Amino acid sequence: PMSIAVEDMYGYVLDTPTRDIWPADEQIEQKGDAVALYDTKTSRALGMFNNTVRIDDLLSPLLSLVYRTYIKGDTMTMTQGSLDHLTLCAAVDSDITFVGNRMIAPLPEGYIPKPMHRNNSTMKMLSLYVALKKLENFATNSYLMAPDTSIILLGAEREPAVNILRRFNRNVSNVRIIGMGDRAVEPNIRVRVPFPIDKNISADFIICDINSYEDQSFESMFSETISVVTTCASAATRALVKINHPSEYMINSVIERLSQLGGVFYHTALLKTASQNPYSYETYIYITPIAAAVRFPFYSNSAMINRYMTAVADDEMPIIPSIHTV
Amino acid sequence: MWHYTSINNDTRVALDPKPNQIRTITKPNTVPQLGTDYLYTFNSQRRSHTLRLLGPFQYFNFSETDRGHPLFRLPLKYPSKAIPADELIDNLHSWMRSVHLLHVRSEDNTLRYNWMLGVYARSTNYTTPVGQLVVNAPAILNYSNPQDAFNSVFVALGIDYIDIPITNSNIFDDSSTPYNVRIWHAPTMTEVNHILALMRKSTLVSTHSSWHWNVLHTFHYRSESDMIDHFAAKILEDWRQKEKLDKGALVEADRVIQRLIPLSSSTYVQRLAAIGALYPNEFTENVLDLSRLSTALLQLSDTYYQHANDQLRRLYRRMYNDSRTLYMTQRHQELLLAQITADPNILLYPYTYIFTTIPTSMNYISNTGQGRIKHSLTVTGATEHDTVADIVLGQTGEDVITISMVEPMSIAVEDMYGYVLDTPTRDIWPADEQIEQKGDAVALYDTKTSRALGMFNNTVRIDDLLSPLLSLVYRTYIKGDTMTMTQGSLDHLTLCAAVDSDITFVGNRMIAPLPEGYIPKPMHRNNSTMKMLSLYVALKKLENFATNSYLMAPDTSIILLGAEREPAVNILRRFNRNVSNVRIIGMGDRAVEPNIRVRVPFPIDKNISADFIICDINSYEDQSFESMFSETISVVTTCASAATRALVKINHPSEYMINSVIERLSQLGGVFYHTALLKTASQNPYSYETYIYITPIAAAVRFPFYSNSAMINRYMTAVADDEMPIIPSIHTVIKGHSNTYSPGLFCGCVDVQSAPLALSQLKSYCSEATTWRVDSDDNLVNIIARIDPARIALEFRTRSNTSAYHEYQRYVPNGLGFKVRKTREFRYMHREVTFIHKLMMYALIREQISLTENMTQVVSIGGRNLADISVVPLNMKYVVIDPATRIETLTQEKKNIEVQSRPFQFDAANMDLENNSIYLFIAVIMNEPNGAATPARMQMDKIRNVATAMLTRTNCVAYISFYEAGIITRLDQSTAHKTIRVEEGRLKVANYVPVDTLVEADVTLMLRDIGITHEIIRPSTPELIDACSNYGIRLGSTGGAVLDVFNHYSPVIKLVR
Amino acid sequence: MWHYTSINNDTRVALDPKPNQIRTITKPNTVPQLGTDYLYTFNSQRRSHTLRLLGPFQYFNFSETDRGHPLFRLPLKYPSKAIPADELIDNLHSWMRSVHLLHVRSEDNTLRYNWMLGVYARSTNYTTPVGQLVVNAPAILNYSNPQDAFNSVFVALGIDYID
Amino acid sequence: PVEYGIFVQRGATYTINAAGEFEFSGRNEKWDQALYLSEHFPALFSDVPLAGANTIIAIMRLFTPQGFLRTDDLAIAANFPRASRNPQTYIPYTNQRGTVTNEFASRFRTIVATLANVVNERAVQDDMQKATRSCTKQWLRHLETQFDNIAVAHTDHLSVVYATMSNFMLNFTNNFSGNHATFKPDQYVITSPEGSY
Amino acid sequence: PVEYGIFVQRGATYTINAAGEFEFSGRNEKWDQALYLSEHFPALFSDVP
Amino acid sequence: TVTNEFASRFRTIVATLANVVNERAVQDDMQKATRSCTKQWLRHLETQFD
């Protein structure tokens, strides 16, 4: 299990685009490498590590301690909107009022609220929320929605993250925090990709975390994720959409579709948060229109892309950690 | 990521201590700790005490002497609170120290103590032959090879088996154990095969695919239900294990398959085992209720077979009949082959069948935890319907779901104190205009206003809208939760509104805690109270605007007027309690002391005076218009002479009335007063009554008079209605693709199996339908579904009827939600003001589009997600031109839509506008296709280009909405800003970048130099009431205030040819 | 603003639970809460304890056995302060869990349990002819049409009325 | 009376549904032995805890059997007729040789301790003279001694007589599983398609 | 009782039209042998489901 | 019913009178024997009534 400081799990890195053009002859090779990587799937070893080193279990000892200090009354002082505050909201399933600007309200006697139930993708969602507040400003100390501003998390089973975000912004007036996606429970609306044509989502922030359909033709996953990116981009001034298969072809074609959607290129960046599962090759993309005309809109030989692209299907069944006795 | 990878290890053999640790396994020196030695929880709302031991002690047969220990009588010392930790600890410690397992200590490193057999011998006081064996030879518990740990005992005893009881993992649950394990002699595979064959002869017996200690053991159940509970818990563990095996994760589980095999079982166990190998469930991270698991898995089974393809059905039946066989995927068997090649001696369940191909069945959603599902029904799906039968919805109890008329507000505290104000525009008031305006006024008064507008005005009362908010402020106060706020702050005034008591401050910020045993009653606010406080705030704000503390200056007086103003005056007084010398008089008819009772006209002798006035007097209900006129004029004159800063209500804000008020003030004070048409957020949202803020100023006012004002327009446009207002129906039958439904809801319930059909038919009328089941026991799914006209406008363009019915089937039975608690829904839901306004535009345009002749098509430009579709009549073809929209060609073909996923080209030459078409640029020109705000000059260029393109065309019509500049100067004055506010001179509609506004005079100027005929138009009151009554929407508190100004200053440009 | 506009609905028929909810109408698992399950107030300066049940329980004929429950002797434990919330809650909870209305559960979506008649049969320990009717045929409380909910009982009993 | 009112408001009987849960009748009524072959059970023996009825539940816990469920192994080896697919018998008490103290007798001591504080609570409720109270207590102590005397005869001798008789040829039915809450006999019938079973 | 209420709601007696279809009274009323010679039949024996 | 409600009512009445007579007897320092005898008489009334 991890042994990090509280703020340390909210961090993110981002690979900015490098190349100024995307020649069709390059598109052929990149598309071929993409379809080839998709049809054969990624490395079995990388998948084994990706599934064994889950982030939720990695952060469990940390979050539980934040919970255990709270119910025993040990915690009582932190800034509102601070990462310790959001982590407390992540840890405990209860409303957390403040008495004064810094003191936390002591629990009523005989009352110990249950730990918040975080599913695996939750910490990543909070991490991307923080990431979106940060990309908005970067000088920020208080990660808290501006009053009368809305965020809309997407993806299956996003309920805990939305409840955490809501309790975190409880003191902020007029903050919509909608969820969507398949298998959604109320408050989160249940929907499926492609979104119904009538549906009209809109927000000042978007965080798509939708998974790709597990079994489909590559052209199908392509059209699906392109429709996703288009939806999220039209929906909000500052989207953050997951890419499950970050091939150079996929990400660049996303930039192309955005270019023909908005005329001028969007200011994209390849984000990767610290609350993602460490081995994940899935990578977020931060899309946002800007007044300036982007130079070097496209990606090439990017690190975020490379983690996926270099996971070619493996030649040997992955080694299993033996326990020797003799 | 194909081949399964896992580590196989016997957690049970790992658990068994080496003999040297047995003496100190009781933790004799150190006290037991939570999360290590044990874990305990009390369950509130169910009053249960669950204590689970950890480490070797998780597996323990208590002696009757052990249950005679106090630690087990501890739950008896309660209900109800959780057992105190010090007592649970002292007791558990003393108990653990009490146990002393028999053993021999030994130097050899290879040995493990056989904890199971030693504990079992202890629990029976060594009376059983295994017990007396343990006594005369304690060393027989030590073992190096795990199987010989039991073989040595079986051979010493001559027994073929041993039946070990299993205690409940909770040790406070002293009740009959569901089953018991039976270790068998085995050890060759052949002996196992023999015992498995012989267990077919016995009654309620089961096994795992493989066995701990490599020693065959079977379960023997007291009843079939116990077998069902166990089989279910295991099917769940194997589904959850298979979920992460298929995901390629390394897995440390003891056996590749965690499902039970029914060696001899009831029919239900057979069906459970059948459905457990099919792995129907979709992956889920949600918490499940284990207590009803069996039932869920039974219901799932009942559905799975109920709607599977005939080959899958036969496959299920094959498993059901060959229940003794262990069905498994190929990768499972590859794992078994691996573990056999690793340890050849291992015993695996012999009778297995490998699936040559995994079944292709739909994955089932199965969240059995709390919370209703809010489905977003898609318009079309793979399934095609043909003459589906009507799905009647059963009546539901009020226990399950109440249906209040009007959704209560959910605003922030400050948000209800906001106000907007329309300043006067015209510099003169010609008598010829006075004639027309007076005639329209007397005509509007004699016939009264719209019956629908009056119905909404009376149903969506503000007091009930704000009640949940104010009560919460009260409830936090009496429970002592609140304690810090600024004096004079809106939270302070709201607290004074909420609670009927004096509220002293200890220091500048802390509130004095209530004396013990004393809980003050909630303040009794009548309907007009919040409006009065809102106008008080408004008057403090108009005085200064930079103010943070709304509190009277010392030695300053305010005098509220109107009937029954007592609560507001008491609130204002308690609010200003710390301010020295503040008069806060009330007046009006039906006044109780302190408020003086008086009637209009005021007695001629009477001489009221103050630095502030708030008249809220109602007009006499039945009088000649000249009578109400003279009355309200006398009111305005009185209030104006009485105070330097009046705020007087106008019940009938006709242009004639308000302008004549300005005239009377002009001849009263010589120079014109600085009037403004205020409207607070605490007014009832539909009210056409509007306040006027009067105040003398040193400057000579330019444009004293009003004309075409928004505040006036809300009243003036409420002409007497042509049709009795629609009443929100609650439909029960769900006809298949039948157009006829009056606006309302689809509350009701239906069997879970019929739920996919109901959702698939609901989509014809409802954009979204929420569903849930009260419990795992109930077969019914309750469903609510607002009828959205837009969806009807989409779904009836063609006779085709299709739905995601196959997807909805995946929900049954555990995918539709669960909620034991009562839910309330409303005939009138809240929506954002902007959405309501867009609906007003769509109605304003739809009313006209139905009128115009020979129009082959409607073309929306930049109308994302077919947003404009409500406007287009079902027969006319509908083209969309927005890059953001994405549609399958088969869908547009299905609904007669024609989407062009390209940006609209605003250049005048290449803009190929067709003849006989209706173009729609509603709320699109302000923004670039990527969403960034355009400069206003660019918007002018857009309108110029579409006009020039319209110059050549015949019978073409275009609607081009745009925000007007005037609203900016309005919103700079106003304090309301929940959804609309100025941002560096641009208005920021919520969830959108702020956009530069256009000047209407410059627009009509360029439009008239281009020479194309045009009309500027805005949605009116009838359109508001139409959109609200049709969509089931109620205007919000802040929304009612902002809507008049926001709507009037967002004109549609109706170009025509 | 002339013609009256109203929705007419039988709040009493709406109140009556479907048969499947009757087993859990007692809120057996979760504890009762103010403003939902019940509402209570003490009146200072008059020394009175007013407790009103909510939901279906607002309409309830208590059995003499029901008044033998501690919850009704609670006001007797005072004057004068308000009854402590924990005690009012524990008592009301135990009491509600004590009631068990006779009913038949059923698959049909159209049915409502006839809460009035079932409660009344309980309050009289099923001694009255309506009571023994409810006992031998609990299913007679289920009804789809609200009028037949009483007609079926009047005809089974031969009675012209029930007080 | 109060614990009784709670108990009986839960109902005098219960059934066990397919889920294995006990659904109580919710209705006061006398038992008849007819019901013995029915799906119904006397509720006192449910061993299901009930809030506010604890003393009744405890005094009920006094009735739980102190024996064990033997398999009729010798009768099986002999192929003696046995209607059960897995023949069994409830021997009332286990042999207890090595102990200083007889567990059966100690159980009777706890039962008598419980009844002692029960009778005591009643006697102080009814203002009984101390002499009569002391005499009932003396009687109970005497029962404990007498029981400790005969205990070895039961647990260590009579138990084997039971274990043999369970294997006799004509002792063919399963009589009791040792769990009062749930046990019902299997009910076979001879069944003509013509006449009644 | 419930089947009874339904049955007697259909009617305690019926007659037979010229078409031969049964026509139930819809009324609960005690039978008398005065009726045996009438058009009426007791409805219990109609054998109409 | 297993139990006659009228008889049970008489049991509550006799319970009330029992604690009444008891409070009086302890107020007047009655010998335990006489107290026990009045109580026995009341229990007898309950049986007769049942």
Ligand SMILES: Nc1nc2c(ncn2[C@@H]2O[C@H](COP(=O)(O)OP(=O)(O)OP(=O)(O)O)[C@@H](O)[C@H]2O)c(=O)[nH]1
């Ligand atoms: N009394 C007693 N029972 C034991 C002991 N060890 C294992 N058992 C029982 O043996 C049974 C068979 O093992 P499983 O049911 O497959 O294992 P489990 O304990 O449920 O753990 P999982 O299957 O991994 O969830 C379990 O029901 C245990 O309760 C022991 O040391 N003492």
Ligand SMILES: Nc1nc2c(ncn2[C@@H]2O[C@H](COP(=O)(O)OP(=O)(O)OP(=O)(O)O)[C@@H](O)[C@H]2O)c(=O)[nH]1
């Ligand atoms: N015991 C009992 N009485 C009931 C039940 N339902 C309705 N009543 C009584 O029937 C009577 C007739 O109904 P109303 O008096 O008109 O209705 P209400 O309960 O007073 O409600 P409102 O008239 O809307 O104020 C009321 O006095 C109720 O107390 C019930 O389920 N049980």
